[PDB]
Amino acid sequence: PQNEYIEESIRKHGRRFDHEERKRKKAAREAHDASLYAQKTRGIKAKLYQEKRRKEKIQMKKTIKQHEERNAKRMITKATFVKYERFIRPMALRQKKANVTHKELGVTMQLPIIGVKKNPQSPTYTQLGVLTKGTVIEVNVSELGKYAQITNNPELDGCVNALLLT
Template sequence: MDYEERKRKKEARAVKKNSKDARKLLGAKGKRFAKKRYAEKAQMKKTLKMHDESSSRQKVDDDVEEGAIPSYLLDRDPTQRAKVLSNTIKQKRKEKAGKWDVPLPKVRPVAEEEMFKVLRTGKRKTKQWKRMVTKATFVGPGFTRKPPKYERFIRPTGLRFTKAHVTHPELKCTFNLDIISVKKNPNGPMYTSLGVMTRGTIIEVNVSELGLVTPAGKVVWGKSSVEKLSFFCPSLRLKPCSINQCFLSVQANTRRLQITRRMMAVSMLSCSCEALIQFWLRC
């Protein structure tokens, strides 16, 4: 019943709380708080500037027209509502930002019982705090295991993937590239940190060998409309695929899974020779 009133009072007190935190916080907390407030103020200034532009007028510098100008137009400067320009600029920004967005699909959440297998330890097998990952994972080359006594999550060597096949549709060339990292697992940050690759996971691969360049001369590390990318592990067979979809199959045996992967989109990064790839993985 008092929710709206309490909310209003809380928002009114937030200014004093922020002021107090800005004066009192020290060290790492103070730095984080200052960085957050700096970003908020910058965003606020941009918003206020956009509101000011929406109702202002500005001079339009057009080419001089041929012929005489009437005397009643000599003192006039052709103006144009800045709102139209600001809307156009905002629309271009949205298009530019959306161009490199990787759409996350709506995937079925994987249950913890399906993702992990409980390992019983101890002399009487009564301890149940260890877990073994049952899905495909990526582990970096510099990874060092913890001592077995303290290792909570175990990632089997047979389920680790380190390579990717990158196929160019125009050149008809396939490049065997390294997987750099797992960027995002839709099931949660814990699975992302473990490097688990389930349906809808975005991974990062090294595409420096492609050497694509934009008309402006910038290096492009990946684009879904240009490249076909898929994933590779030992004993893979490449199947026919369309321009924007790649399918690879791993023959199932005692140590390998039957896996189908589909590339959806990639993103552009600058200096680290890497690209984001969204793929589907069915175990």
């Protein structure tokens, strides 16, 4: 069949006989259906409806609020950066780039980790380059050599989210 064939069929033969009655009644009874859906359902499907109704309630509150306004083992267990290397540093834990967000600019910039300045946890972590919360790290800011503070936990989040010391 060609192009909008059902539209042609609707035009040349009409829609269903009671179609307006069915859709009007469906448009009439969802108010009762919604409350029945909210009171009988249990579990994840309940919880998703719980949060999405709050979404629409807050939204409808804001659009209506706008309205009168219109009317008015010896191994590393944390992320690392690259005898002294007594412990094992996996290539998996190795981190090279960080998401450094400028304070004044307020833009998260992808910057390579030039090095780790100091680890507040222990000097051994700084020597081993163990990335932790509150550890100072220096990165190149030519495209923006500046220090920054980690605002995230690379062990859990898996991404080096840090804020520039500027």
